[PDB]
């Protein structure tokens, strides 16, 4: 198609304008005094929300260049929430601050590349100071406290998360499902989790979390790439008959088969979802067999001369639930008999001994950890379902937050960590003056979220900022109570992982935009 | 699609103009001297109505932002009518008053959140004062009186209702249906009512009542989430023969299945409605079986491996009638054997003995209450179908009003209760000045309905308001007769519940609009 | 009195308990008190410093303590030789309020046609 | 009249565009390879010129704001030529550089006042480095070299100027006239010069110099301020007979009288020009009397009761020539008797013995130096009238430059003094970073003239700039011969006074414009 090509200053102003729409929309929601955004729906009543992730999702602009800006920040910022379970909005206001100052500078005649290098130096430093400020969360006393705080002072939720983590370990797999009737339950079931996400959205049956959820599905395990639905049909009919869901695991699923499957389950014919088999090379075949043992299926490989058309319901594995992310798949309550599974574990566990290589040994260890590890399942009861769904939501958010803490610790929330960390870097320098301007740009940017929060409250951002900078450690401003003090003690905190991800991703995309000299889109 | 995004002042005035159209259209109908609204139809001659709910239903605006506004108040205000059987028009004029003043204040530079907090404080204060002002309706004399007043002073109607409540209790389930000839009938039948409403509008075949009404329908009881109508087809085609309607009670009806159900029943192919199964977890399955017994159907649960395709007409339950609200499902005259039903009752009642907890007990007592309780059916007699249909309608309204009265009592109608209550709160204060302005905003808005009624009467609203503020208790202005005095004595009253509801939902949606800083909609 | 507008903001900071006959009157009072911060906020603004912060710091101290905008230094304004005659500050405030009062109470304007 | 008022950023770009037209116009004339600018005249053929002053005089822009900018730099830059006899184009290109960069910085959010401070520091430091870099012009051999170089290498002009200064001293008054024939002449005559200029333009009959030149005029001396032309009329008519011009020396000539004089001398009858009496107070009356003695006139003062109405041709003074600048009046060959003049010298010289105060001693010394010192008249001869006029011009120019050189010395021309100095100041810092940017702005600005010159020569500006920055002292680029070397040795030089003046006035106006936040003009 004939394109429209814009260069330099213009490309930059269009982009700025697009992200300004995006950020100005999302940042009104920041903090406890945050405002509402109303999002129209063609059918039904409009949606009222304080959730900036939702708001971001809705933003698309008419002008193509402006939309490019908005969509760039939108995506890279999504990556923050994806990593730590939170921080997308923050990533966004940071991005907006850095880009505004950065562009100002570039247009003022400073070198885009030197500015980017300075920004990134400042960010690296900031992440280290962040490691310094972080308060560790390690014994389950801290664990339960953190979960509790994230649950909005529900101590039951803290007790719960901590019990789960002690049962399955801190790195162990934990699931949440609806409760049976007002008492919580906790059980370890046969299960596994690996890093492969859906091969396409539209498989998503749980739009809140953006995930795939299947109950008691059969699971198809085939070691080959599946490009054509011609091989699949008999197994698909056995699955149409047994009226159960189905999970496809292959070397990959592409093209004809992929489109036909998406179209098919979206039209409600034979509900199916597909993900890639984990890993590559020989360990791919092996892990495929591991999952087979866990779920009680048989791997179908062309290598042994097995064909997918002659495959039946019997060759398949099975489990009670599966949940699939953008990047993660979790298999819950697998049917495979205990003999097969623990004997397989013994095999691999002996392979750990016979290991001639450190790498190989560790790969085998990963495998036994997953297979033998099992899955923690929290069933949330409330007495009257409303209270249950609410609590359950609270439990899931708290869980993500607690995992982030368990990994990297917690820091003062409400953006005082960022403004703190930033207050310490004033002496930071680069290789030349442009680099230095880049550094100062980022430091000023780290003041943005706290200032937005303070603004939504009707207070003067510069004064609050001044007071917080004047103090030390985790000293900051509690926007909720309008009270200064120690932010951890006052129970206002973010996982260190969350703030780090927010700043890093923000700075990444801002750097990319600051260094963009040309844009290409289609003509209207 | 590409969006249009508005901020702050711009979006707020937009919203304001939208709710002003809705309210101004709706409030012309208020009071005894209320005016007519003419609603166009593509087919035939237009509708002339004094009913503000219908008017509300019709309002949709050309401007997307303005439409969002109107739709918001429409949605939250509709709820008062949902709860109390009345109060939606009131809620809307109340809301308009709160919104106009509130946004006015916001526009002056006051803190939106503080305005909100102050409004909510005045509303809490007010609901309490309403309980203070409230007059109990307890004995069946007063009950019959309230009924007679809601039927437009038809004592037959009062007599009938009081007789119904005496047969099934004040909390008991009561129904109204067409009569078999001139004279009324009253019968108690096996039946149940639980709080789950239609899973979608468009299921409504009776727009006067905002209800779904099905005669001699089949009932499908499934313990499953139903996502795919392919599962339904044998059952739906089987129900398409025998030419009877179908009620789906399941864990939920989602996506494809729901969409197809809506479409099919709206194109007249098979009349169908879907509702959520009551409760959650295990006791959900228990109640489902309760319903199954009541209707002589069979619950289809995946747990033992039953599939919906393998369901036949015989697995379906039946009743002479079902009625579905937004929040309610009521089943009338089930086919279930008296032996079966009574045996299930016996079982639950012994389960009550072994109960190791009060919680378990109260839940069971609720269940046997429903099952053993049955349903009162009032058949309205007339002589000439026209008179019957009319009287029936009046009986329904009176029924709803009387139930609202038995629950929370009655207070002086004509919007004078609200203004009385506001006069008692003149000293109410907040944490700061903006909070105080919010309070005064609410107190002043509470004068709006009365003031409107009086305007429609062609009288001077301020003078009447002033005179009413000057008196005490249930002293107020009777607009029909242009007479001041004791409003309860004059038979002009509202259930305390509907006035409460109107005020609360009004303040709710108003609070939300006052805190909206951004709106996102599609492009024209 | 202390110049650079700190006399007006001092004076204003002492009147926080001033109340009128009703709420609109109360609003009148706060409008005017808040207005008295305007000259220093402006002075500070032209200097490229943050008006709100300086204002804040000045209100916190007492007497003729204020901000010297020339030197960016806090202290005793009079001791720093920075002052206005009391008469000029009064006249500025009083006349300002006079015309402002008149404009606020103006309901109609008549001028010739273009 | 109603005004158009622009603020801030908008106003600044208006100014920027205005000085951009002026400068881009003037700066093409700069190199020895400088280009031509063509100036339309309504009657006859257009003017082809390389004189940037001439170009500047013509520039007036349609947009009132753009015009304000242009006129600002135009006026203060004119002040440079006025001080040193040269440097106006330089001042203008310098100003354009500083304004462009400075406003860039301001728009990027740097403090206007701090940028001004930084610029002003850099210039003060630079003027010092310029003084260090300066070469003295002291012995008359050096004086003759400077004159010769300024004369386009005519050793005759150097000879002339040196002989002239030797006749009258370094500070003595020197004038140039038409020669009476081939082979120049020099004579010292009775004459004087004091610093008072015309009281108004439009008195100018010599637009080339922008000066007043009157031949054999009458001189009026009044110790009064003249507000009304009625007192003047008999005197104006007395001057009207004998058909000679008239010089007014008074306390002042104001309002009606001055306007009427400008007007009358503009209609071509009664050619007259007016100036203030030199000095003020009592020393002014004394000095007036000195001029009276020199010219053989009589002071007319009201103190002794003399009135202008009774003044005749006899009271009027006389001289062979008078020349009046914007800032200077010089009177050449007065009719006063040698006795009168030398006797007045004796009066004052005896007053010097009696002085009990040093200040008075200095003032009297000033007066006898002026009186007894006389005026040098250089009469320039050549072969043909044309050659004579050409040479006369070369002599006038050379004299300006040589005077400037005797005062402050010479520095490397071709704009390399500026770029040299700038290279010496690279380490200079201010009180904060904004001040630093100010400093770098001015330093960068100092390269602009040389860069312009190299561009006009068709060579690469960055490259030449660089090579000159690499050497030391008076090392630079000769644009004419495209040869690098020692600029003074190659005979390419500017008086230190003109380069200094240029940089200072340029930075002056630039400083003002950068700190301009509001512009006010008339409506179109």
| Inter-chain CB proximity B114 and A458 less than 8 Å | yes
Cβ pairs bridging B and C (under 8 Å): 3
How would DSSP label each residue in D458-489?
A: TS-HHHHHHHHHHS-TTEEEETTTTEEEETTT
Helix axes A112-133, A433-445, angle to 10 degrees: 50
Breaks after residues in chain A, judged by C–N over 2.5 Å: none
Tell whether A109 is within 8 A of chain D (Cβ).
yes
Pick the residue of C37, C49, C52 with the most A CBs within 10 A to test the interface with A by mutation. Answer: C52
Instruction: Flag whether C touches D (3+ CB pairs, 8 A cutoff).
Output: yes
Residue of D nearest to A105 (CA): D108
For the record, the structure tokens of D200 come out as 């108004």
The C-alpha atoms of residue D500 and residue A82 are separated, in whole angstroms, by 63
Integer Cα distance of A244 and A218 in angstroms: 7
**Integer Cα distance of C107 and C102 in angstroms:** 10
Chain A residues in contact with B75 by the CB 8 A cut-off are 45
Clarify whether residues B265 and B335 are in a common domain.
yes
Whether A313 and A185 share a structural domain: no
Interchain pair B112, A35: CB under 8 A: yes
Minimal CA–CA distance to A477: which of A424, A420, A423, A425? A420
| Pair D498, D486: CB distance under 8 Å | no
Between CA D185 and CA D163 the distance in angstroms is 11
Q: In the numeric block, which tokens belong to residue B70?
A: 């109107």
Q: How many CB atoms lie within 10 A of CB D392?
A: 20
Examine the fold and report which residue of B315, B341, B371 is the final residue of a domain before the chain moves on: B371
Mutate to test the interface with B, among C19, C23, C24, C33 (most CBs of B within 10 A): C23
Nearest residue on chain C to D111, alpha-carbon basis:
C48
C-alpha span between A318 and A328 (Å, rounded): 19
B79 and B218 co-located in one domain: no
For chain B, what percentages of helix, strand and coil (3-state, to nearest 5) are there?
A: 55, 20, 30
Residues 6+ apart with CB under 8 A from C105: none
Angstrom distance (rounded) from CA B372 to CA B355: 19
Cα–Cα nearest to D84, from D323, D503, D403: D403
Tell me the H-state helices in A433-495.
433-445, 448-456, 461-470
Residues, chain A: 524
Separation CA B162–CA B63 (nearest Å):
49
For residues C38 and C47, the answer to whether their CB atoms sit within 8 Å is no
Q: What is the CATH number of the domain that holds A315?
A: 3.50.7.10
Q: For chains A and D, what is the number of CB pairs under 8 angstroms? A: 9
The H or E element spanning position A35 is none
Q: B223 and B338 share a domain?
A: yes
Tokens 């609901």 -> residue: B127
Sign of the dihedral defined by the CA atoms of residues D198, D200, D205, D209, in that order: positive
Chain B positions touching C23 (Cβ under 8 A) are 436, 440
Chain-chain contact of B68 with A40 (C-beta, under 8 angstroms)? yes
Q: Is B89 annotated as a binding residue?
A: yes
Which of the residues D100, D108, D110, D439 would you substitute to probe the A interface, choosing the one with the greatest number of A C-beta atoms within 10 Å?
D108
CB atoms within 10 A of CB D287: 22
Q: Does C contact A via 3+ CB–CB distances below 8 Å?
A: yes
Nearest alpha-carbon partner for A120 in A135, A98, A141 = A98
Together in a domain, B268 and B348: yes
Distance CA D511, CA D445 (A): 13
Distance, in Å, from the CA atom of D448 to the CA atom of D92, rounded to the nearest integer, reads 10
Q: Do C47 and D114 touch (CB under 8 A)?
A: no
Beta strands in chain C (DSSP E): 65-68, 73-76
Elucidation method: X-ray
* Cβ of residue A302 closer than 8 Å to a chain C Cβ: no
Q: Which residues of D142-159 are buried (b: 16+ CB within 10 A; e: fewer)?
A: bbbbbbbbbbeebebbbe
Question: Which element (helix H / strand E) includes D221?
Answer: strand D218-221
- D203 and D352 inside one domain: yes
User: What three-state secondary structure class fits A34?
Assistant: coil
- Tell me the nearest-neighbour CA distance from C23 into chain B, angstroms: 9
Spatial neighbors of B10 by CB under 8 A, at least 6 apart, are none
Domain of B175, CATH number, reads 3.30.260.10
In whole angstroms, give the CA distance from residue A378 to residue A372.
19
- Chain C contact probe: residue of A447, A451, A463, A469 with most C CBs at under 10 A: A463
D113 near C CB under 8 A: yes
| Nearest-neighbour CA in chain B from A181: distance (Å) | 5
For residue A427, the chain D residues in CB contact (below 8 A) are: none
Minimal C-alpha gap between B72 and chain A (Å)? 6
| HSE toward the beta carbon, residue D24, CA cutoff 13 A | 7
Q: Judge if A157 and A205 occupy the same domain.
A: no
Q: Which residues of A touch B2 (CB under 8 A)?
A: 60-62, 67
Element (H, E) at B149: helix B140-150
Angle at alpha carbon of residue D313, lines to D311 and D318, rounded to 5°:
120
| Contact by Cβ (8 Å): B437, B105 | yes
Distance CA A247, CA A192 (A): 14
Residues in D closer than 8 angstroms to A109, CB to CB, are 104
D108 touches chain A (CB under 8 A): yes
Same domain, D212 and D153: no
How many contacts (CB atoms, under 8 Å) link C and D?
A: 6
Q: Tokens standing for B384?
A: 């000439």
Which residues on chain C are in Cβ contact (under 8 Å) with B433?
Answer: 26
Joined together, the tokens standing for residue A337 give: 């008999």
Sign of CA dihedral A34, A35, A40, A44: positive
Residue in A closest to C50 by C-alpha: A462
Token digits for A58?
Answer: 């809705």
Q: Give kind and range of the element (H or E) at residue D294.
A: helix D281-295
Q: Which of A366, A203, A198 minimizes the C-alpha distance to A279?
A: A366
Q: How far apart are CA B321 and CA B191, in angstroms?
A: 10
Contact D129, D421 (CB under 8 A): yes
The reply to whether B217 and B356 lie within a common domain is: yes
D435 touches chain C (CB under 8 A): no
Which whole-number Å values give the CA distances from B393 to B85, B380, B493, in the listed order? 13, 10, 20
Q: Which residues contact B514 (CB under 8 A, 6 or more apart)?
A: B99, B102, B103, B106, B112, B115, B116, B119
- Which region holds residue D202: left if phi is over 0, alpha if psi is between -120 and 50, else beta? left
Q: Is C69 annotated as a binding residue?
A: yes
Q: Hunting for tokens 């239609």 — which residue is that? A: B198
Identify which of D327, D100, D308 has the alpha carbon closest to the alpha carbon of residue D223: D308
Residue A40 contacts B, CB cutoff 8 Å: yes
Residues of C in contact with A462 (CB under 8 A): 50, 52-53
Quote the tokens at residue A36: 């509402």
Spatial neighbors of B345 by CB under 8 A, at least 6 apart, are: B368, B371, B372
Instruction: Give the alpha-carbon dihedral of A191, A196, A202, A205, to 10 degrees.
Output: 20
Q: Which residues contact A236 (CB under 8 A, 6 or more apart)?
A: A229, A246, A270, A272
CA nearest D332: which of D276, D369, D374, D367?
A: D374
d(CA A376, CA A192): 10
CA atoms within 13 A on the CB side of A127: 16
Choose among D199, D212, D325: nearest CA to D258: D199
Q: Let me know whether A361 and A404 are in one domain.
A: no
SS (H, E, C) A315-343: CCEEEEEEEECCCCEEEEEECCCHHHHHH
CB proximity A467 to C under 8 Å: no
The domain of D164 spans 135-190+372-409
A58 closest CB neighbour out of B3, B281, B309: B3
| Count of Cβ atoms closer than 10 Å to residue B319 Cβ | 29
Residues of A in contact with C52 (CB under 8 A): 460, 462-463
Q: Do D104 and A104 touch (CB under 8 A)?
A: no
Residues of chain D positioned with their CB less than 8 A from the CB of A108: 104-105, 107-108
The CATH number covering residue D436 comes to 1.10.560.10
C 46-75 → A contacts, CB under 8 A: 50, 52-53, 56
Structure token pair of residue D486: 């020692």
Taking the CA atoms of residue D430, residue D431, residue D432 and residue D433 in that order, the dihedral angle to the nearest 10 degrees is: 0
In angstroms, rounded to a whole number, what is the distance separating the alpha carbons of residues A506 and A441? 13
Residue D255 phi, psi dihedral angles, 5° rounding: 55, -125
Whole-angstrom distance, CA of residue B419 vs CA of residue B447:
5
Tokens at residue B405, please?
């009265």
Tally of domains in chain B: 3
Write out the two tokens for B52: 């503000």
Q: Are residues A484 and A420 in the same domain?
A: yes
* Residues of B with Cβ-Cβ distance to A24 under 8 angstroms: 7, 518
Residue ending a domain, among B371, B395, B422, is: B371
The annotation status of A120 as a binding-site residue, yes or no, is no
Q: Which residue of D has its CA nearest to C45?
A: D111
- DSSP strand E in B280-409: where? 300-301, 317-324, 329-334, 375-380
| Contact call for residues A349 and A361 (beta carbons, < 8 A) | no
Domain boundary among A358, A381, A409: A409
Are B286 and B367 contacting, i.e. CB atoms less than 8 angstroms apart? yes
Question: In Å, how far is B48's CA from the nearest CA of chain A?
Answer: 26
- Decide if A73 contacts A79 (C-beta within 8 A): no
Q: Could you tell me if B205 and B251 lie in one domain?
A: yes
The tokens for D182 are 């081939």
């Amino acid at each position: 198609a004939a394109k429209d090509v814009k260069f330099g200053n213009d490309a930059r102003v269009k982009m700025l304008r697009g992200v300004n729409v995006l950020a100005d929309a999302v940042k009104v929601t920041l903090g406890p005094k945050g405002r509402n955004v109303v999002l129209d729906k063609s059918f039904g009543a409009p949606t009222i929300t304080k959730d900036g992730v939702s708001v971001a999702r809705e933003i698309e602009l008419e002008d193509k260049f402006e939309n490019m800006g908005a969509q760039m920040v939108k995506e890279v910022a999504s990556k923050a929430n994806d990593a730590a379970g939170d921080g997308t909005t923050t990533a966004t206001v940071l991005a907006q601050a850095i880009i505004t100052e950065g562009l100002a500078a570039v247009a003022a005649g400073m070198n885009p590349m030197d500015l980017k290098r300075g920004i990134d130096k400042a960010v690296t430093a900031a992440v280290e100071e962040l490691k310094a400020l972080s308060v560790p969360c390690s014994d389950s006393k801290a664990i339960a406290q953190v979960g509790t705080i994230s649950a909005n002072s529900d101590e039951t939720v803290g007790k719960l998360i901590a019990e789960a983590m002690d049962k399955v370990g801190k790195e162990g797999v934990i699931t949440v499902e609806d409760g049976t009737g007002l008492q919580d339950e906790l059980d370890v079931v046969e299960g596994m989790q690996f890093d492969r996400g859906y091969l396409s959205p539209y498989f998503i049956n749980k739009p809140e979390t953006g995930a795939v959820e299947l109950e008691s599905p059969f699971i198809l395990l085939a070691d080959k790439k599946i490009s054509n639905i011609r091989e699949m049909l008999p197994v698909l009919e056995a699955v149409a008959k047994a009226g159960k869901p189905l999970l496809i695991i292959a070397e990959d699923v592409e093209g004809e088969a992929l489109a036909t499957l998406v179209v098919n389950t979206m039209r409600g014919i034979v509900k199916v979802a597909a993900v890639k088999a984990p890993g590559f090379g020989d360990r791919r075949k092996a892990m495929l067999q591991d999952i087979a043992t866990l779920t009680g299926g048989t791997v179908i490989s062309e290598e042994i001369g097995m064909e997918l058309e002659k495959a039946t319901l019997e060759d398949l594995g099975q489990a009670k639930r599966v949940v699939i992310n953008k990047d993660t798949t979790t298999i819950i309550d697998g049917v495979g008999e205990e003999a097969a599974i623990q004997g397989r574990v013994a095999q691999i566990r002996q392979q750990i001994e016979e290991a001639t290589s450190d790498y190989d040994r560790e790969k085998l260890q990963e495998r036994v950890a997953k297979l033998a590890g099992g899955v923690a399942v929290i069933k949330v009861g409330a007495a009257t379902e409303v209270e249950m769904k609410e609590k359950k939501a609270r439990v899931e958010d708290a869980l993500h937050a607690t995992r982030a803490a368990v990994e990297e610790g917690v820091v003062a929330g409400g953006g005082v960590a960022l403004i703190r960390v930033a207050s310490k870097l004033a002496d930071l320098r680069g290789q030349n003056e442009d680099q230095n301007v880049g550094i100062k740009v980022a430091l000023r940017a780290m003041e943005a979220p706290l200032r937005q929060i303070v603004l939504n409250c009707g207070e003067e951002p510069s004064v609050v900022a001044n007071t917080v900078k004047g103090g030390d450690g985790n000293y900051g401003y509690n926007a909720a109570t309008e009270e200064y003090g120690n932010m951890i003690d006052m129970g206002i905190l973010d996982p260190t992982k969350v703030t780090r991800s927010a700043l890093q991703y923000a700075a990444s995309v801002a750097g990319l935009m600051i260094t963009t000299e040309c844009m290409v889109t289609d003509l209207p």
